[PDB]
Design a protein around this ligand. Structure first.
Ligand SMILES: NCCCCN1N=C(c2ccc(NC(=O)N3Cc4ccncc4C3)cc2)C[C@H](c2cccc3ncccc23)C1=O
Ligand SMILES: NCCCCN1N=C(c2ccc(NC(=O)N3Cc4ccncc4C3)cc2)C[C@H](c2cccc3ncccc23)C1=O
Ligand SMILES: [Cl-]
Ligand SMILES: [Cl-]
Ligand SMILES: [Cl-]
Ligand SMILES: [Cl-]
Lengths: 463, 463
């Protein structure tokens, strides 16, 4: 990796575009205008990409050579990057202040600021927009995962009367569904801010290296089947595959995808009759979790439950809602996003089914079907000093008030009703709102404040 | 990186689920039945992740330790992975056959096949599903980029009478709007299969290291402004920013975002009157590219052009379509995906505007607003040998016919009419068709067949 090569092409040219005698560019990150967002992911970027000696003689010459051919001119700022190398031993003269990781912030507030600490490096603040704005993703996953926790919590509380197993109810299936190994880790780490159930292994090593937990790993799995391990027995032997699988994993929970041929037959005839004896004997600590994986998600869950309710002893819990015996659960792991997770719980509740009957697997919903669009994640200049005069800088497009940017030096404050407000135009220094809630997280190549994954989990908890 | 940590958790448990006496698992990848999809990206994964010594004593012990905590049990196949280390010096005993990269194959056809080469490693075929299936992303970017090239080609040919500059008409803007650095490089490399214009610099080093080009670089940029470099001059000095920027970049093409306050004023009064004189003097090899970045994309482009047509000398070209003078072009960079790119060119054509007037930049649309669900990218077991007898295996969910999988040993063939067929049940060995178009790309830890980025470009041409 080379930070000189980790920006949008055009930013290479920007040091020739700013007003002359510009000593300071100051830029903020907000989720412009999902009423509240989990701030998480910055600390990864600060450590993996921004901290320490990031500039070397070789990194300057590589960039020089690529940009020379990429632009077909020598528009690269060699002098500016050689200054970083020789003044600061390659350490970025940037100061980043940020709200603490895990913080649940209303939309349209300052979550971090970037500014240069050396007037020579005025151009450096917005060089690192592109890299810093990839934060959108950890923030977005963490927010959409938490929104889903909220829906599950609402219907579990309504149909059971507690949150038991809440943080194991949305399993991450998204390892194949993402754009990369780097993306898998960050995405799966963002979901583990809210839940403890993941198949995306890469997330675990990231949290250990970048955040830390007191526990060995932040996330857990149980044994489960895929279509390869059922269908490999042959279209005539589904029962043999199931029987081998529940018996191999007799003492632990086990997911078995049951839609290889006929979900409704596998539930009713194979689990419900021929193998019923291997399921009703199993421990409360080791249920069979029947996985449908195809068809209308809501219709399939409701017919799966009706079949299972008629072949197994169903309890009515305190709330008047029906419950499988504790050895038997369901997980819908196909076509699940925040919208369909909500269609299912509401559909289950209208049929008087407890939500403790159902778990969710999401892959693409949770980790891939997200954009910087969704929460309008955005990095803009708000303040510059030219000729010694600080001036308040913003965009305010004619046709889009939604894209207006915030003016001048920003601080984040607690209101007397204990809500958040971003103060603009350096009005934070009028101490009308107490102290700035953002902290210095990065200064002059060093990480100056960091959070355990446990602290972030605590910060991110639901009301 | 540790391939023992680079799979779905549940696949760790799969070696205890397959029928006993299973010597071979054979699995294929399809874009299950965007009519045609560019295969690109496998070679990256084979080199970065699968080739050489991938197993070490330390990588087995690390996996054992993580999975012990992750499963709350020792379900890990240490014996199976120690065999790989001690038999094959950690080289995967896998054979992957793949269609040549850049090959444009209709939906529902085998693109790559994975099989174990040693009976002991039956479990290893689907260990690498997760990692291999991330290919959906390079494939989907490459295909969606190409389908957009098709629409550009259609409307340019209809309104100009050639495809001049087609490879620079869709610029990659999506570096900040992807989920990570690794994803940027892959996605930007996938787009450059079809175009030459990128701001996603990370794509350059990937193509150089993994694919190779005869030219210095596969992709090119020009100097261009952001909101920070216009608004930094002060709300009332937009004209000074513009004038500084186009004068700095007098002799090369220059993109200038003009929606900082009011796009329509900046086109009509600032470009069209105040600074008119520095635009009409510019070389045909260095035009001003006015970038609107806000509003209804179609409505904005149409009023932008109507304003510019009334301040600058417009020609009607041979097709009856209108043309800005050669020093003046427009780029819509904001809200651009395949569907809005199509709304715009069709809207432009209804207002008799040549498509050679307009360039497109795409960020989120191009690199992130893509899912594994779009082309149904899918990896399934089709054939296993159990007790020495091959059996043809598949899924066939009753309630989703389109998730039915192919049976048995697969090959890809040219038809008599120059189309493709995927043969099933090992029918390829009848040579009633020509010969299998999949080739050995990976065998027993080696990349065996590779393609230059140039070969891939050639294969991925339009008609
Ligand atoms: N971890 C200890 C706590 C309990 C364990 N546990 N585990 C659960 C789980 C854990 C992993 C898996 N995994 C798969 O199915 N895969 C892996 C995978 C990867 C890629 N593609 C497809 C698949 C299929 C499935 C289920 C669901 C399940 C539970 C099922 C009902 C309702 C519940 N409600 C609350 C709390 C859990 C509840 C559950 O109890
Ligand atoms: N090497 C020579 C290639 C041609 C030069 N050129 N370049 C062009 C271009 C090149 C880069 C940029 N860059 C930005 O605007 N950024 C960078 C960026 C990154 C992230 N977010 C936002 C932005 C804003 C914009 C436009 C458009 C422009 C052209 C404009 C009309 C129609 C055409 N038709 C065909 C061929 C080009 C045609 C064009 O001619
Ligand atoms: Cl599966
Ligand atoms: Cl999914
Ligand atoms: Cl911009
Ligand atoms: Cl975009």
């Amino acid at each position: 990796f080379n930070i000189l090569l980790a920006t949008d092409s055009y930013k290479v040219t920007h040091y020739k575009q700013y007003p002359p005698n510009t000593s300071k560019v100051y830029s903020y990150f907000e989720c412009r205008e999902y009423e509240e967002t989990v701030f998480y992911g910055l600390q990864y970027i600060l450590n993996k990409y921004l901290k320490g000696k990031v500039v070397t003689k070789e990194k300057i010459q590589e960039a020089k050579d690529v940009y020379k051919e990429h632009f077909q001119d020598d528009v690269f700022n060699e002098k500016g990057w050689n200054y970083i190398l020789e003044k600061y031993d390659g350490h970025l003269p940037i100061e980043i202040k940020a709200v603490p990781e895990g913080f649940v912030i209303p939309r349209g507030n300052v979550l971090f600021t970037v500014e240069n600490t050396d007037p020579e490096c005025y151009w450096l603040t917005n060089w690192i927009e592109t890299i810093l704005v990839q934060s959108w993703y950890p923030i977005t996953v963490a927010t959409n995962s938490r929104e889903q926790k909220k829906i599950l919590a609402k219907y579990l509380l309504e149909t059971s009367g507690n949150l038991d197993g809440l943080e194991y109810k949305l399993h991450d299936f998204g390892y194949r569904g993402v754009s990369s190994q780097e993306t898998a880790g960050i995405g799966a780490s963002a979901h583990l801010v809210n839940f403890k159930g993941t198949d995306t292994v890469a997330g675990l090593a990231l949290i250990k290296k970048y955040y830390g937990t007191k526990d060995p790993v932040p996330g857990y799995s149980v044994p489960a089947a895929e279509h390869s391990t059922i269908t490999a027995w042959g279209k005539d032997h589904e029962k043999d595959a199931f029987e081998h699988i529940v018996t191999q994993f007799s003492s632990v929970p086990v997911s078995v995808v049951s839609d290889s041929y006929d979900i409704y037959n596998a539930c009713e005839k194979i689990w419900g009759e021929d193998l019923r004896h291997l399921i009703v004997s199993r421990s409360t600590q080791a249920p069979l979790i029947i996985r449908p994986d195809s068809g209308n998600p809501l219709d399939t869950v409701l017919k799966v439950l009706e079949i299972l309710g008629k072949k197994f002893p169903v309890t009515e819990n305190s709330k008047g809602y029906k419950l499988l015996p504790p050895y038997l659960r369901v997980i819908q792991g196909d076509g699940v996003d925040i919208n369909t997770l909500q269609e299912i719980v509401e559909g289950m509740k209208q049929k008087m089914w407890s939500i403790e009957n159902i778990a969710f697997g999401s892959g693409g919903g949770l980790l891939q079907k997200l954009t910087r669009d969704l929460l309008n994640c955005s990095f803009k200049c708000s303040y510059v000093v030219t000729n010694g005069l600080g001036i308040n800088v913003f965009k305010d497009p004619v046709a889009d008030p939604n894209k207006r940017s915030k003016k001048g030096r920003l601080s984040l404050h607690r209101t007397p009703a204990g809500n958040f407000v971003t103060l603009e135009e350096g009005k934070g220094d009028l101490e009308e709102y107490g102290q700035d809630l953002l902290h210095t997280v990065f200064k002059n190549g060093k990480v100056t404040k960091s959070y355990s994954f446990d602290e972030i989990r605590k910060n991110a908890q639901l009301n």
